[PDB]
Design an enzyme around this catalytic site. Structure first.
Site, PDB file in Angstrom:
ATOM      1  N   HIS A 183      70.241  10.528  18.058  1.00  0.00           N
ATOM      2  CA  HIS A 183      71.646  10.286  18.374  1.00  0.00           C
ATOM      3  C   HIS A 183      72.587  10.583  17.214  1.00  0.00           C
ATOM      4  O   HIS A 183      73.780  10.799  17.454  1.00  0.00           O
ATOM      5  CB  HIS A 183      71.894   8.857  18.896  1.00  0.00           C
ATOM      6  CG  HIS A 183      71.248   7.762  18.106  1.00  0.00           C
ATOM      7  ND1 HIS A 183      71.928   7.033  17.154  1.00  0.00           N
ATOM      8  CD2 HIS A 183      70.013   7.210  18.191  1.00  0.00           C
ATOM      9  CE1 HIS A 183      71.125   6.111  16.654  1.00  0.00           C
ATOM     10  NE2 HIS A 183      69.957   6.198  17.264  1.00  0.00           N
ATOM     11  N   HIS A 235      75.739   7.413   8.350  1.00  0.00           N
ATOM     12  CA  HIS A 235      75.649   8.410   9.405  1.00  0.00           C
ATOM     13  C   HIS A 235      77.070   8.719   9.854  1.00  0.00           C
ATOM     14  O   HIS A 235      78.022   8.048   9.449  1.00  0.00           O
ATOM     15  CB  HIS A 235      74.831   7.905  10.600  1.00  0.00           C
ATOM     16  CG  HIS A 235      75.411   6.679  11.228  1.00  0.00           C
ATOM     17  ND1 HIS A 235      75.062   5.403  10.835  1.00  0.00           N
ATOM     18  CD2 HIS A 235      76.346   6.532  12.197  1.00  0.00           C
ATOM     19  CE1 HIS A 235      75.754   4.525  11.540  1.00  0.00           C
ATOM     20  NE2 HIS A 235      76.543   5.184  12.371  1.00  0.00           N
ATOM     21  N   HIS A 244      79.650  10.039  13.396  1.00  0.00           N
ATOM     22  CA  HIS A 244      79.877  10.348  14.802  1.00  0.00           C
ATOM     23  C   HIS A 244      80.888  11.481  14.843  1.00  0.00           C
ATOM     24  O   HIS A 244      81.822  11.500  14.038  1.00  0.00           O
ATOM     25  CB  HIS A 244      80.418   9.135  15.558  1.00  0.00           C
ATOM     26  CG  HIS A 244      79.558   7.921  15.423  1.00  0.00           C
ATOM     27  ND1 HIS A 244      78.620   7.569  16.370  1.00  0.00           N
ATOM     28  CD2 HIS A 244      79.477   6.988  14.442  1.00  0.00           C
ATOM     29  CE1 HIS A 244      78.000   6.467  15.979  1.00  0.00           C
ATOM     30  NE2 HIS A 244      78.501   6.095  14.813  1.00  0.00           N
ATOM     31  N   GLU A 256      85.098   7.113  16.471  1.00  0.00           N
ATOM     32  CA  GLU A 256      84.883   5.951  17.319  1.00  0.00           C
ATOM     33  C   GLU A 256      86.112   5.050  17.282  1.00  0.00           C
ATOM     34  O   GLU A 256      86.750   4.808  18.308  1.00  0.00           O
ATOM     35  CB  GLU A 256      83.618   5.220  16.860  1.00  0.00           C
ATOM     36  CG  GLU A 256      82.386   6.119  16.932  1.00  0.00           C
ATOM     37  CD  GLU A 256      81.119   5.339  17.217  1.00  0.00           C
ATOM     38  OE1 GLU A 256      80.759   4.459  16.405  1.00  0.00           O
ATOM     39  OE2 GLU A 256      80.497   5.596  18.266  1.00  0.00           O
ATOM     40  N   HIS A 288      80.046   6.159   8.821  1.00  0.00           N
ATOM     41  CA  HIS A 288      79.695   4.745   8.810  1.00  0.00           C
ATOM     42  C   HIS A 288      78.693   4.511   7.693  1.00  0.00           C
ATOM     43  O   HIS A 288      77.577   5.044   7.744  1.00  0.00           O
ATOM     44  CB  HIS A 288      79.129   4.322  10.169  1.00  0.00           C
ATOM     45  CG  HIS A 288      80.167   4.251  11.246  1.00  0.00           C
ATOM     46  ND1 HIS A 288      79.853   4.227  12.588  1.00  0.00           N
ATOM     47  CD2 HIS A 288      81.519   4.207  11.174  1.00  0.00           C
ATOM     48  CE1 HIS A 288      80.964   4.154  13.296  1.00  0.00           C
ATOM     49  NE2 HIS A 288      81.992   4.144  12.463  1.00  0.00           N
ATOM     50  N   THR A 318      77.996   0.047  17.229  1.00  0.00           N
ATOM     51  CA  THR A 318      78.555   0.905  18.268  1.00  0.00           C
ATOM     52  C   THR A 318      77.494   1.658  19.045  1.00  0.00           C
ATOM     53  O   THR A 318      77.843   2.458  19.918  1.00  0.00           O
ATOM     54  CB  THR A 318      79.555   1.918  17.685  1.00  0.00           C
ATOM     55  OG1 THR A 318      78.860   2.876  16.880  1.00  0.00           O
ATOM     56  CG2 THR A 318      80.642   1.213  16.869  1.00  0.00           C
ATOM     57  N   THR A 319      76.219   1.456  18.742  1.00  0.00           N
ATOM     58  CA  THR A 319      75.151   1.985  19.570  1.00  0.00           C
ATOM     59  C   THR A 319      74.250   0.841  19.993  1.00  0.00           C
ATOM     60  O   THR A 319      74.200  -0.204  19.333  1.00  0.00           O
ATOM     61  CB  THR A 319      74.318   3.048  18.840  1.00  0.00           C
ATOM     62  OG1 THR A 319      73.798   2.493  17.624  1.00  0.00           O
ATOM     63  CG2 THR A 319      75.170   4.268  18.520  1.00  0.00           C
TER      64      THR A 319
HETATM   65  N1  LIG Z   1      77.254   2.957  14.738  1.00  0.00           N
HETATM   66  S1  LIG Z   1      77.065   1.585  13.744  1.00  0.00           S
HETATM   67  O1  LIG Z   1      77.843   0.467  14.289  1.00  0.00           O
HETATM   68  O2  LIG Z   1      77.565   1.750  12.375  1.00  0.00           O
HETATM   69  C1  LIG Z   1      75.319   1.117  13.757  1.00  0.00           C
HETATM   70  C2  LIG Z   1      74.737   1.075  15.148  1.00  0.00           C
HETATM   71  C3  LIG Z   1      73.492   0.751  15.302  1.00  0.00           C
HETATM   72  C4  LIG Z   1      72.625   0.415  14.110  1.00  0.00           C
HETATM   73  C5  LIG Z   1      71.242   0.053  14.601  1.00  0.00           C
HETATM   74  C6  LIG Z   1      70.444   1.020  15.191  1.00  0.00           C
HETATM   75  N2  LIG Z   1      69.236   0.670  15.680  1.00  0.00           N
HETATM   76  C7  LIG Z   1      68.826  -0.604  15.634  1.00  0.00           C
HETATM   77  C8  LIG Z   1      67.586  -0.953  16.142  1.00  0.00           C
HETATM   78  C9  LIG Z   1      67.158  -2.270  16.094  1.00  0.00           C
HETATM   79  C10 LIG Z   1      67.964  -3.247  15.547  1.00  0.00           C
HETATM   80  C11 LIG Z   1      69.200  -2.897  15.044  1.00  0.00           C
HETATM   81  C12 LIG Z   1      69.627  -1.576  15.087  1.00  0.00           C
HETATM   82  C13 LIG Z   1      70.840  -1.240  14.590  1.00  0.00           C
HETATM   83  C14 LIG Z   1      73.115   0.429  12.886  1.00  0.00           C
HETATM   84  C15 LIG Z   1      74.586   0.818  12.695  1.00  0.00           C
HETATM   85 ZN   LIG Z   2      77.976   4.506  13.549  1.00  0.00          ZN
END
Ligand SMILES: NS(=O)(=O)c1ccc(-c2cnc3ccccc3c2)cc1
Ligand SMILES: [Zn+2]
Length: 257
Positions: A61, A91, A93, A103, A116, A195-196
């Protein structure tokens, strides 16, 4: 499983992740006229001189540049935060077109991409424990606008060919994330979520008011990445952003007048 397509995109996530309809979801629109200046907000403290990057990974992703978070090396403090947050990964977006991709939005304006920098609160011991806590993460969000190139981004751009498809990774040592920051550390802040998926409501969002400029060629090379794994039909990794979510009962504070 979840993704960004018509049949598994943000409009679908709530079925596997009901918190998608929760009370503190991200991203949000930042209405600059409604965000209140908070003179008690302290300056951000970004201590990246000792950062230890390790690896860059295409996770299907986005791509993550990962850091050694086994010690206090690169940490975020100050601003709205209590305690110390270790950088674990950053990372982006981004869009299929320069006019979309971020986002968060600012007065409904969309930037071409959003960076991010993800940090977790050391008082919870590890990243997996932190995401289960309402103050577990601090994510530093930085908008990208298309214009002049960002020199400190080019090492990231250069390696994307080697991690084209889901599950590929490459050595990425000795990368200095200080080269991705704008001049000013003025910021907005509000309580939100990943956000994911799993969309956990564990993030203090710190969004810098000053975007960085990247070149059209830099973001063009982002869009040559693939969502799919090797040997599968090619799906360009573009428009991997979640749209703005209802602010509900939240106030965005500004560090600046
Ligand atoms: N897009 S963001 O808000 O900065 C972001 C979104 C998702 C994660 C993330 C990804 N995969 C995971 C899997 C298991 C537990 C927590 C996770 C967090 C880490 C950061
Ligand atoms: Zn992000």
């Amino acid at each position: 499983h979840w993704g960004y397509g018509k049949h598994n995109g943000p409009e679908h996530w709530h079925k596997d992740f009901p918190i998608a309809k929760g009370e503190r979801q991200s991203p949000v629109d930042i209405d600059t006229h409604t965000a209140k200046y908070d003179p008690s907000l302290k300056p951000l403290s970004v201590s990246y001189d000792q950062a230890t990057s390790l690896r860059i990974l295409n996770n299907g992703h986005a791509f993550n540049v990962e850091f050694d978070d086994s010690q206090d090396k690169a940490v975020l403090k100050g601003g709205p935060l209590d305690g110390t947050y270790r950088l674990i990964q950053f990372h982006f977006h981004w869009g299929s077109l320069d006019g979309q991709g971020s986002e968060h939005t600012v007065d409904k304006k969309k930037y071409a991409a959003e960076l991010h920098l993800v940090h977790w609160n050391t008082k919870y011991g590890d990243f997996g424990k932190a995401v289960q806590q309402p103050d577990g993460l601090a994510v530093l969000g930085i908008f990208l606008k298309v214009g002049s190139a960002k020199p400190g981004l080019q090492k990231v751009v250069d390696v994307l060919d080697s991690i084209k498809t889901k599950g590929k990774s490459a050595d990425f040592t000795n990368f200095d994330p200080r080269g991705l920051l704008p001049e000013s550390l003025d910021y907005w802040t509000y309580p939100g979520s990943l956000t994911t998926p799993p969309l956990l409501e564990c993030v203090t969002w710190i969004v810098l008011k000053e975007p960085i400029s990247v070149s059209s060629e830099q973001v063009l090379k982002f869009r040559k990445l693939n969502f799919n794994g090797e040997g599968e039909p090619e799906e360009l990794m573009v428009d991997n952003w979640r749209p703005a979510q209802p602010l509900k009962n939240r106030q965005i504070k500004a560090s600046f007048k």
